[PDB]
Design a protein around this ligand. Structure first.
Ligand code: TA1
Ligand code: GTP
Ligand code: GDP
Ligand code: ADP
Ligand code: MG
Ligand code: MG
Lengths: 356, 441, 434
């Protein structure tokens, strides 16, 4: 208690896509450092936004190319030092459909994201100071929000026509919200967590739509728990005091307008739910921004499961970071601007982090 | 011959339509069974006017109309009414449930399943027409059907038909009166989607017509049946020259040309001056000067806005009956002499005139008197921007807190769609301002 | 094309239903043997909304009666309008819930809900296009709370794109009729806040005050309380059965009454009501009906709107009326009483008019209000709740049936969060510039 933090802000720009090269769209997003400027195609006006870090992955030729490992060592490594210091940690993305979110946190086989780097770097960090004075313990789960329902992705299943088992949320009067039945499996080596991860991502819900051939029909939260047992000077029982750190790495879905990417059936329902969830999230950020202005505000958490489980990961007791993602095409002006506005709001959120 | 198709979307549209088709059936001699009795003396002719009614060999006249509500009540009041044997049985209740005053239901969840059928029927109608000259869409900013379905339909028609005049008659949301908590949203989204497809949207308000029926007709307790009968006359004044003979005939394109300077300011207001009881039909001369000045009184406008807080960009005065052009020349001169009626510097010729020889018909059971002269004023003014501003402000007051949004997002919509719309309307307000700045070298 | 399923759980539910069907039949012209003996032809145009044809121009209700005590079902059968119901829709057991939410939700209701769901599926699949459901249930006891909420959850899971409405008799402030009301109410609220779309909160003390002041009745039985509630139930769904100048339905009301999803708890009311003698001294016009509607002493919710601000109100008028006077009167209510409304909603009043009034009235009106004063109910429960829960006063009868304390804390938290969401919108503060 007594801490006073800020919900940090990173902002990536992806390259031109296939559709964006089919239809020759021009450049509207520009980077000049940590300040990012977007102006309309019709030369109406110019908006510029201040942020904590920016990442211009547009072209490999530029100076200051912000590849995967730069994003990592700028966001996760600080968060990892905080997690080893005795804090809980959260890193959550936000953006448009196809804006480059799952490329960042998790990533592709030949260019991993923050998850396969965070887990490996903390394994190494443990390998340098796993004394017999201080011992370490690791477990994890990796769960999914799909159509208002929680799913566990690290679950081997048999062959069925009906096999997808939804879990429940509950509220512990001290610990806060949590999930009932979330298999937290022990992970003592990098091969183990890699096998878990590839068991998970292969279970995450996806489908082909207009803006992505492999789109995300769900939100994904990666729950990696680390306890560390330490000794202080007492002549009785030692290895006596525990310090815990829960890591929550969050990749969300898109906005999914039904005109830019027409859908019918299940592909339409998911979209609705996704959008609904995101809307509530916006309110939270806005409302919490108002809490920085000293105004009496009520934060809606309970309208969705995402904003309910991550209650403590926005206010509460954890150090949290946002990653906005945008596109350089002159089409995605309104979605880009809504993104950057929500990031400007999230910049202003404070959080009272607990030392464990 | 010349032919126009009417599309009566929504409760409001259907009620306006029932009134209008009552009026047209009376004007042309058609009975509710479709059977004209006096064609036995004509032997064909064209007095069974092809602008609105298609004729069979059996002597039955069928209106060129389409009726959509997305709920069964209103059209079932037609199928079981006095005009059940007039309309083709293809009046379209495919509405097992309605739009719940949600543009998202009206444009995506139930915007689809019904529009293919609507368009097929319009196609069947238009194939029966040689000289198709325009569409007339009756609807209401405020609901879902009359907002979203109208938006979608105009989108499809601007593809399938193209350069055909698509005029609209819309109920505008009033400042004080309102029958719903979510009319601002719907109105803004509709004006966003329609403003790139419509050619001229004739806007009315209900507070205005209530005040008219009170002050002039002396009805202290009016209802919609007493209101729409006025609106009908406006259409009968717009659609007169396509039916009857006159001295200065006005085809539909003449509106689209003269009242629409720039392609985004096509929102003119309607006005009908000789709204008099049969009592006050006596005691008054009802000359062209009186009616033409009444049309310019701010208290007799059918949209609650003051032209005195703005300027006139255009005005089309459509006359009916014993009217001589000299009277109109004198009247417009008297108006140009008056200083309270200010025009833009870039419109010295601001008046369009039309004279038909056929006076209006008196609907049996109505509140309006029999007249020898009638006038309809369609005026494009800068005042209505203020009205738009009001709506936009309301939008803000709720969009700040994201109220009533999960009903829209919940029925297939992104939240960004809101912001986009608002921006357009803001630009439109600016555009109105831009056309009020006087020109300087 | 717009069909409604009725479910009745418990004494309160079954007794209100017995009166509600008795009223809808009177409106539509159905006799106690299922036969149509009415005068107007509009009564049959939309009979499908509440009824089904069987064989011989006989009309059977689309109802489902639920209990865990036979005595409430026999009362229906041994009644005036009992022989019209489908006997295969009486789903009852024995050895009821015992004023225990647990027994109705987890133990006994778990052994009986499957039958109810079978009947629900049978009655829904026979629909061309179902609009929603309709549960009359008391909370303050067991079955109506537990079995009710369970059915609600399962229908919402099976039928999520429909409307789920509840007419609920909440506890009263002064006198209790069950000693374990707080727990059960808090848990039923924990279940309803997350699954319903619009619930109508009723309180017997308000209706006693109505029967005493307005109607001047000195010996009011429950058939009179339920007579008022049925009036309301009818009025909510009037613009689906009959025609009007400006129609509405449950979805349009919900869209125009629920700004945020959780605040779907409403105060009902109905006008005109008067003593049998005082009807010759009163003109029945829109002004008098509005004066009676927005009067604090005509609500059934036992919460003074003068202690809050209306978020959004709805008026479903029935009769031949002028829309000018409706809109004028509602505007006047908003302007003269500007402090009891919100600024961030410009017009808080939804309107609807049906042209076909009730059997003996020239005009009538139904009122649905969403106000912050509802907090004064839940807060009370929460106080009561903790006063018991701090001591574990009656818990072992709930834990013995397969519960835990986390459920209680969850329910209390949900209720208090809702109270705060209602509180944030009654402080009429001024912004910096506006
Ligand atoms: C002929 C006449 O003027 O007598 C009226 C009458 O005196 C009053 C008092 C009636 C009377 O109702 C009551 O006195 C009453 C008693 C206990 C609880 C509630 C009401 C009436 O009994 C009730 C009855 O109202 C109806 O019949 C409506 O259709 C009503 N349906 C039923 O009452 C009904 C119930 C069971 C079986 C058959 C019909 C209704 C209300 C809302 C929606 C649909 C239907 C009417 C006109 C009257 C009497 C008969 C005195 C009132 O009825 C209602 C709910 O509006 C009570 O206040 C109104 C005002 C009427 O003036
Ligand atoms: N002038 C006029 N306005 C009407 C009439 N009927 C309804 N309105 C207006 O229409 C608005 C309500 O929207 P509607 O046109 O009814 O919407 P809808 O077409 O019924 O679509 P849904 O909401 O899905 O039922 C109200 O604000 C009324 O002022 C009418 O007969 N005449
Ligand atoms: N308004 C009204 N409320 C009732 C009536 N009968 C019972 N109630 C309420 O409903 C509750 C009855 O609970 P109930 O479900 O029947 O208990 P159970 O028999 O064990 O299932 C009581 O607490 C009353 O407050 C009635 O006729 N009218
Ligand atoms: N900096 C980059 N360089 C090359 N490709 C990129 C870059 N950022 C994103 N992509 C590509 O964008 C595609 C989709 O991005 P992703 O965030 O996975 O979409 P979604 O958010 O729908 O999951 C991926 O196939 C990825 O290869
Ligand atoms: Mg993804
Ligand atoms: Mg309608």
């Amino acid at each position: 208690l007594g801490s006073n933090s800020q919900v940090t802000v990173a902002v990536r720009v992806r390259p031109f896509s296939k559709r964006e090269k089919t239809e020759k769209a021009s450049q509207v997003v520009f980077t000049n450092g940590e300040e990012i400027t977007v102006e309309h195609p019709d030369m109406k006006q110019v908006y510029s936004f201040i942020y904590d870090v920016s990442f211009w992955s547009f072209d490999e030729c530029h100076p200051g190319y912000a590849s995967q490992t730069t994003v990592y060592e700028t966001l996760a490594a600080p968060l990892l030092d905080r997690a080893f210091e005795g804090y809980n940690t959260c890193l959550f993305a936000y953006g448009q459909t196809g804006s480059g979110k799952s490329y960042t946190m998790m990533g592709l086989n030949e260019e991993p994201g923050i998850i396969p780097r965070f887990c490996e770097d903390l394994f190494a960090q443990i390998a340098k100071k796993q004394t017999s004075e201080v011992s370490y313990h690791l477990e994890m789960s990796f769960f999914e929000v799909y159509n208002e329902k929680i799913h566990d992705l690290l679950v081997c299943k048999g062959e069925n026509g009906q096999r997808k088992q939804p879990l429940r949320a509950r509220e512990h009067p001290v610990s806060g919200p949590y999930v009932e039945g979330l298999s937290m499996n022990v992970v003592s080596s990098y091969s183990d967590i890699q096998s878990w991860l590839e068991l998970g991502n292969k279970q995450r819900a996806t489908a082909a739509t207009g803006m992505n051939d492999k789109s995300s029909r769900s939100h994904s939260v990666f729950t990696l728990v680390m306890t560390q047992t330490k000794t202080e000077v007492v002549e009785g029982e030692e290895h006596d005091h525990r310090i815990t750190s829960r890591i929550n790495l969050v990749d969300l879905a898109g906005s999914e307008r039904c005109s830019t990417a027409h859908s019918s059936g299940q592909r339409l329902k998911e979209g609705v739910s996704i959008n609904k969830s995101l809307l509530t999230l916006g309110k939270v950020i806005s409302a919490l921004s108002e809490q920085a202005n000293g105004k009496r505000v009520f934060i809606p958490y309970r309208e969705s499961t995402l904003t309910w489980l991550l209650k403590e990961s926005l206010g509460g007791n954890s150090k949290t970071a946002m990653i906005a993602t945008v596109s350089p095409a002159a089409s995605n002006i309104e979605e880009t601007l809504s993104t950057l506005r929500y990031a400007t709001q999230a910049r202003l959120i404070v959080n009272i982090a607990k030392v464990n | 011959m010349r032919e126009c198709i009417s599309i009566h979307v929504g409760q409001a549209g259907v009620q306006i339509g029932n009134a209008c088709w009552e009026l047209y059936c009376l004007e042309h001699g058609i009975q509710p069974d479709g059977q004209m009795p006096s064609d036995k003396t004509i032997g064909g002719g064209d007095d069974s006017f092809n602008t609105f009614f298609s004729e069979t060999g059996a002597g039955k006249h069928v209106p060129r109309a389409v009726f959509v509500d997305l709920e069964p009540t209103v059209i079932d009041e037609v199928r079981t009414g006095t005009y059940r044997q007039l309309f083709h049985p293809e009046q379209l209740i495919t509405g097992k449930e309605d739009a719940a005053n949600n543009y998202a239901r009206g444009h995506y969840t139930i915007g689809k399943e019904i529009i293919d059928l609507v368009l097929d029927r319009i196609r069947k109608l238009a194939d029966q027409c040689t000289g198709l000259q325009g569409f007339l869409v009756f609807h209401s900013f405020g609901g879902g059907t009359g907002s979203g379905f109208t938006s979608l339909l105009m989108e499809r028609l601007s593809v399938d038909y193209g350069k055909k005049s698509k005029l609209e008659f819309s109920i505008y949301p009033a400042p004080q009166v309102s029958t719903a908590v979510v009319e601002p949203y719907n109105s803004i989204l509709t004006t966003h989607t329609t403003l790139e497809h419509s050619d001229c949207a004739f806007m009315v308000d209900n507070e205005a017509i209530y005040d008219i029926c009170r002050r002039n007709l002396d009805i202290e307790r009016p209802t919609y049946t007493n209101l729409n009968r006025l609106i009908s006359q406006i259409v009968s004044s717009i659609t007169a020259s396509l039916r009857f003979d006159g001295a200065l005939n006005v085809d539909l394109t003449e509106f689209q040309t003269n009242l629409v300077p720039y392609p985004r300011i096509h929102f003119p207001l309607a006005t009908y001056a000789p709204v008099i009881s049969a009592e006050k039909a006596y005691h008054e001369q009802l000359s062209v000067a009186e009616i033409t000045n009444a049309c310019f009184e701010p208290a007799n406008q059918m949209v609650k806005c003051d032209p005195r807080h703005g300027k006139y960009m255009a005005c089309c005065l459509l006359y009916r009956g014993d009217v001589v052009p000299k009277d109109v020349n004198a009247a417009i001169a008297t108006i140009k002499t008056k200083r309270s009626i200010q025009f833009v510097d870039w419109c010295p010729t601001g008046f369009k005139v039309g004279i038909n020889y056929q006076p209006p018909t008196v609907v049996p059971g109505g509140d309006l008197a029999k007249v020898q002269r009638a006038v309809c004023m369609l005026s494009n003014t800068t005042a209505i921007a203020e009205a738009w501003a009001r709506l936009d402000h309301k939008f803000d007051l709720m969009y700040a807190k994201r109220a009533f949004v999960h009903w829209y997002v919940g029925e297939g919509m992104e939240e960004g769609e809101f912001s986009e719309a608002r921006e357009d309307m803001a630009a439109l307000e600016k555009d109105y301002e831009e056309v009020g700045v006087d020109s300087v070298e | 094309m717009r069909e409604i399923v009725h479910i009745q759980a418990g004494q309160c539910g079954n007794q209100i239903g017995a009166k509600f069907w008795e009223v809808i039949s009177d409106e539509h012209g159905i006799d106690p043997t299922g036969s149509y003996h009415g005068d107007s032809d509009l009564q049959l145009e939309r009979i499908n909304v509440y009824y089904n044809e069987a064989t011989g121009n006989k009309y059977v209700p689309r109802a489902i009666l639920v209990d865990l005590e036979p005595g409430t079902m026999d009362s229906v059968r041994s009644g005036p309008f009992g022989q019209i119901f489908r006997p295969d829709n009486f789903v009852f057991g024995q050895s009821g819930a015992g004023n225990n939410w647990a027994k109705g939700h987890y133990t006994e209701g778990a052994e009986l809900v499957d039958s109810v769901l079978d009947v629900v599926r049978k009655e829904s699949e026979s629909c061309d296009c179902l609009q929603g459901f309709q549960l009359t249930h008391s909370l303050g006891g067991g079955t109506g709370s537990g079995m009710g909420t369970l059915l609600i959850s399962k229908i919402r899971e099976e039928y999520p794109d429909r409307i789920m409405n509840t007419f609920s008799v909440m506890p009263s402030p002064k006198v209790s009729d069950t000693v374990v009301e707080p727990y059960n109410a808090t848990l039923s609220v924990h279940q309803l806040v997350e699954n319903t779309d619009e619930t109508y909160c009723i309180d017997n003390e308000a209706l006693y005050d109505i029967c005493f002041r307005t109607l001047k009745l000195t010996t009011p039985t429950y058939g009179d309380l339920n007579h008022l509630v049925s009036a309301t139930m009818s009025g909510v769904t009037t613009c689906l059965r009959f025609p009007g100048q400006l129609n509405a339905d449950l979805r349009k009301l919900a869209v125009n009454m629920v700004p945020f999803p959780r605040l779907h708890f409403f105060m009902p009311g109905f006008a005109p009501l008067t003593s049998r003698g005082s009807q010759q001294y009163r003109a029945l016009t829109v002004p008098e009906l509005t004066q009676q509607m927005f009067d604090s002493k005509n609500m059934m919710a036992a919460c003074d709107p003068r202690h809050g601000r209306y978020l959004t109100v709805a008026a479903i008028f029935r009769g031949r009326m002028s829309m000018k006077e409706v809109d004028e009167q509602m505007l006047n209510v908003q302007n003269k009483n500007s402090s009891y409304f919100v600024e961030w909603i410009p017009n808080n009043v939804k309107t609807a008019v049906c042209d076909i009034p009730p059997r003996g009235l020239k005009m009538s009106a139904t009122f649905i209000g969403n106000s912050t004063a509802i907090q004064e109910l839940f807060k009370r429960i929460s106080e009561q709740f903790t006063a018991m829960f701090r001591r574990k006063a009656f818990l072992h009868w709930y834990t013995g049936e397969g519960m835990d304390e986390m459920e209680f804390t969850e329910a209390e938290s949900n209720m208090n969060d809702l109270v705060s969401e209602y509180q944030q919108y009654q402080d009429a503060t001024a912004d910096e510039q506006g």
